Every structure is written in C-alpha cells, then in structure tokens.
Amino acid sequence: VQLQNVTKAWGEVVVSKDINLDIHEGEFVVFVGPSGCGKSTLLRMIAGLETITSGDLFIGEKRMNDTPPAERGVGMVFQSYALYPHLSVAENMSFGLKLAGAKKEVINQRVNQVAEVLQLAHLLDRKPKALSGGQRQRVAIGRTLVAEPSVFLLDEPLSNLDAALRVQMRIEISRLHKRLGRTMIYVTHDQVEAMTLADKIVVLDAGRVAQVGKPLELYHYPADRFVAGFIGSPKMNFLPVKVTATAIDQVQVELPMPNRQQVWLPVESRDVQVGANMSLGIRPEHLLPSDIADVILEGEVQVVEQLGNETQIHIQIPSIRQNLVYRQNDVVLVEEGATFAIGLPPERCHLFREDGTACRRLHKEPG
C-alpha cells in the first residue's frame, strides 16, 4: 500500500490534506490522533467506502482508484454487519463466498483454515444466538479472512479501552498479525494502544499527517510540539527559554528560574538566532534524582502519588506557570508542601521553535 497526495474534500471543505504514505508489505500500521482528525475517513478511503477527490491510491503496485472495492484485494472488518441468525458460524463466514459463486470445496477449506487461526473450529456449526460477545467479534474477523485479502483493515472498536470486549479485540489483532504476517491497518485515538501494537505509526492532526515512524522514533524524536505531547503520559513538560548562544549543532538556552542558568543542548541549531523565545521539553521519566550536580530545578511539592511500581510528584517551580511533573521508581517518600529538587539532563531535552517545530536532537538512542 502506497498513498500519493491523496486528498478528500466536499465542495471546499478539506477533510484529508494530500496524504503521503508508503506502507511496506507485512507491516502493521496504526492511524492515531484526536477525535475528528480524519483517521477513519482515511481508512474508509483505502477500503473504497468513501471516494478520493484527488491523488493516487496504490495497492500492490497498481492504481486502485476507479477499481471496484471488491477487486482491490483489501478486506475491511465490518463491525456492524449483524450475523445472519438461523445460520451456523460456518454458514455466516462462508455466506459471502456463496453469492460470489465459490465451490463447496474452496468454501469448506478456507473456512477450516480461518477456523484455526481464530479458534472457532469447535464452534463452526453453532447458532449465533449461542455465541458469546467475545466470539461473535471473532466470527466477523473470520468473515473478512475467508475472502483471503492481502490488506487487512480494522477501524476503531466502539468499545472503551478498558471495556473487556476491546481488550479481546486488541489481543486478537496482535495474535492475528503474529500468525499470518499480512499487511494490516488499525485505527484508534488511544496513544498507548498505538505504541503497543504498531510496526509503524502515523499521527494525524486536523486532517494532515503530523509524523510517521516507529513507536520509538516518535518517542525520542517528535518532529513538533503536537507529537511531543501526544505520545507518552503523563505528558512531556514544556519550559519557556531564550536562546543565548549558538555553535555548530548546539544552541545554548537560558532557564526561567531566578539566577537564569545557561545550558547547551545537542540540538539541530540550523536557524535559531540568539534572543529567540523557545520551548524546552523534558519528559517526567527522564528527569533525575537531583543527586547529580549540573542543572537543578527546585520547588514545593503540590501532589504525591504512590502507585506501588513508581511514584509521581507534582512540583511548583517559582517562575513557571504550570506544575512540573516528576516520575521515579519505587517509593521516594515526600510530603506535600515540602521543597523538592530534581536534575535536568541536557542530553534528554527537546527544543521547539515558535511554529512548534522541533530543532532536531543530535543525541543517540536505542532504536
């Protein structure tokens, strides 16, 4: 699958801004982004359930616009297509293969193959009325798998991320991937779901693509403020800073606290200009226990959460509007109202310009 300047608009309203994507075979892709960003319309377009106003959709290697959705090789899981009561799980899954003209031979052979990957063999000849919710969901997936598609497409489960039925879905999805290894495209609004299942993630915002990449790439190198705060929770901290110097690929900024300390960041530096007002980002997990000298931020403890596996502190630093959120492992016994100090590692900091674009990190990391 490959997208080329694909756009979707009604009259003059643009819901999908010329999207460019390149999905390599076998990849598990997930479209993520806030409500109404256009993740589902984009999916439906690939499926053929919505028209593409301009642009090219390549599936396999050949243009698929103009081609009937059935002959594209794509398969969408129709989450709301009610099972045909008074029909066996097998009859339901094979139903579609009937009007098409398939032979009992292929039918009762492709039905036994999907019946294995989805664990339904022992439920095949059963009435829907006797199936649980968790297994009715699987019959739907099996329904789209017997048509033997080359691109599996699934949209957001109308469930609710902790809703048992959606946890099932999530496990089945990954199981199915590590089994057939076929190309898949999933849609969700939940950042965690994305970081968990994806091979490649495409963050969407206001109909445009904010960024595309591996989970770890989005994590360590967000291209802008939006992505920086969309992946990871609790959310990245943002502190206001001013540029005071510039070397080759470095950039020295000044911290807001009194005594305005200066720190160098291994950042892009391309075009910055001394005196500019920028935004410095540092994730709560990456702050340090302050035992380590260098740059130290200090305030008064506003909140303390003991979660067992870790501890989250909310500190209020004098000369910063929003509370700084700290995160460490195990205990760390502190009382509200007490003064707490934490370290600021320049190698783990991010720098964002006025447009919110990130002045690239030059550090190195695991993926």
CA 342/CA 60 separation, integer angstroms: 52
Task: Measure the CA angle with vertex 126, ends 124 and 130; round to 5°.
Answer: 130
Q: Smallest distance, Å, CB 160 to a second copy? A: 5
Q: Which is nearer to a second copy, 101 or 366 (CB)?
A: 366
State yes or no: 229 annotated in a binding site: no
Residue 174: its H or E element: helix 164-180
Q: Smallest distance, Å, CB 119 to a second copy? A: 16
**Judged by CB under 8 A, does residue 292 bind a second copy?**
no
**Judged by CB under 8 A, does residue 364 bind a second copy?**
no
State yes or no: 39 annotated in a binding site: yes
Q: Smallest distance, Å, CB 285 to a second copy? A: 4
State yes or no: 281 annotated in a binding site: no
**Judged by CB under 8 A, does residue 215 bind a second copy?**
yes
Q: Which is nearer to a second copy, 8 or 166 (CB)?
A: 166
Tell me the sheet residues that pair with 186. Answer: 30, 154
**Judged by CB under 8 A, does residue 366 bind a second copy?**
yes
Task: Measure the CA angle with vertex 235, ends 348 and 256; round to 5°.
Answer: 60
Q: Which is nearer to a second copy, 2 or 312 (CB)?
A: 312
State yes or no: 364 annotated in a binding site: no
Identify which range of 10-18, 63-71, 145-153, 212-220 contacts a second copy by CB under 8 A: 212-220
Which 8-state DSSP code applies to residue 76?
E
* Segment 131 to 160, residues that bind a second copy, using CB under 8 A: 160
CB 6 within 8 A of CB 57: yes
What is the pattern of x (binds a second copy, CB under 8 A) and - over residues 109-128? --------------------
Beta-carbon contacts of 84 under 8 Å, excluding residues fewer than 6 positions away, are: 91, 92, 95, 128
**Judged by CB under 8 A, does residue 367 bind a second copy?**
yes
Identify which range of 113-121, 135-143, 189-197, 258-266 contacts a second copy by CB under 8 A: 189-197
Using CB under 8 A, pick the residue from 336, 338, 341, 357 that binds a second copy: 336
* DSSP-assigned letters across all residues of 224-273: BHHHHHHSSSSPPEEEEEEEEE--TT--EEE-SSTT--EEE--B--SS--
* Angle (deg, nearest 10), helices 104-117 and 164-180: 110
CA 303/CA 289 separation, integer angstroms: 17
CB 13 within 8 A of CB 33: no
Using CB under 8 A, pick the residue from 2, 4, 41, 174 that binds a second copy: 174
Q: Smallest distance, Å, CB 142 to a second copy? A: 23
From first CA to last CA, the distance across the chain in angstroms is: 24
Q: Which of 22, 31, 24 is nearest to 198 (CA)?
A: 31
- Burial status of residue 363 (CB atoms within 10 A of its CB: 0-12, 13-18, 19 or more): middle
**Judged by CB under 8 A, does residue 303 bind a second copy?**
yes
Using CB under 8 A, pick the residue from 330, 335, 354, 355 that binds a second copy: 330
**Judged by CB under 8 A, does residue 277 bind a second copy?**
no
Q: Which is nearer to a second copy, 26 or 69 (CB)?
A: 26
How many residues bind a second copy (CB under 8 A)? The answer is: 33
Q: Which is nearer to a second copy, 116 or 336 (CB)?
A: 336
Tell me the sheet residues that pair with 204. Answer: 209
Using CB under 8 A, pick the residue from 31, 152, 219, 352 that binds a second copy: 219
Q: How many CB atoms lie within 10 A of CB 292?
A: 12
Tokens of 207: 């109909």
State yes or no: 308 annotated in a binding site: no
- Burial status of residue 13 (CB atoms within 10 A of its CB: 0-12, 13-18, 19 or more): exposed
State yes or no: 150 annotated in a binding site: no
Identify which range of 55-63, 119-127, 258-266, 328-336 contacts a second copy by CB under 8 A: 328-336
The binding site consists of: 33-40
The binding site for ATP consists of: 33-40
- Which residues form the interface with a second copy (CB under 8 A)? 160-163, 174, 178, 190, 192, 195-196, 215-216, 219-220, 231-232, 283, 285, 303, 305-309, 327, 329-331, 333, 336, 365-367
